[PDB]
Amino acid sequence: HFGYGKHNGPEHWHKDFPIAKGERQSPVDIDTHTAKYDPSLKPLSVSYDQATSLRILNNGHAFNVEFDDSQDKAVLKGGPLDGTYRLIQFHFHWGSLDGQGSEHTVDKKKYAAELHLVHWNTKYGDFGKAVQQPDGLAVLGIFLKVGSAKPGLQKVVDVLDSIKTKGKSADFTNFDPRGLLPESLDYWTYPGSLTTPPLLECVTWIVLKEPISVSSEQVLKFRKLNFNGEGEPEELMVDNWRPAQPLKNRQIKASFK
Ligand SMILES: [Zn+2]
Secondary structure, three states: OOOOOOOOOHHHHHHOOHHHHOOOOOOOEEOOOOOEEOOOOOOEEEEOOOOOEEEEEEOOOOEEEEEOOOOOOOEEEEOOOOOOEEEEEEEEEEOOOOOOOOOOEEOOEOOOEEEEEEEEEHHHOOHHHHOOOOOOEEEEEEEEEEOOOOHHHHHHHHHHHHHOOOOOEEEOOOOOHHHHOOOOOOEEEEEEOOOOOOOOOOEEEEEEOOOEEEOHHHHHHHOOOEOOOOOOOOOEOOOOOOOOOOOOOOOOEEOOO
């Protein structure tokens, strides 16, 4: 399919996925001085109290924590959104060094990692239908900086040894994603795309202004994962981020001044 190496990384993706050079690709640099404050934007409503996590999976590109999305248990509403979006999975992107790893940048600043909480619009019935629609997905993006540990992340870090290689999965129940949220829900929002193939332009991005802090030891453990399957040559899962793409004909809006 695709990868992040010299011979199959983001600069090559357009050959198999021509939408890679499309009009509403992600990630982008958020220029904080040109972003438009929009007083019409509502506060985000994050209702994760009834979330049911199921499983954690190394898919060869990242690790996903998957949720039961067969009912309205963990949903995102409000903000720039119309209707109700259900949480299906979260994952991260990270670097080989603390100075890189995020996909979005803020005034060209990179963070150590970026967390993506992926939600789909319930009007379309399932995730597969939702990705074919311009308002199909909402992805909440949260930056990670290295500093103090995030206690709510530790359950994730501890299980990574069990899913080291591609295709491995493990039961992962009773995880509360509320422990990964910053104090403030102020955000930027713009229309974009998935940042991995198939790169579909179906995402309303909601990128939180406030980063969360994780410890050096926590992010070090992400870097021990493998892109490869068991029994194949070891290649460390690091730098699984796509570089910033042109903004083109889009405006970034801010919920705050
Ligand atoms: Zn992502």
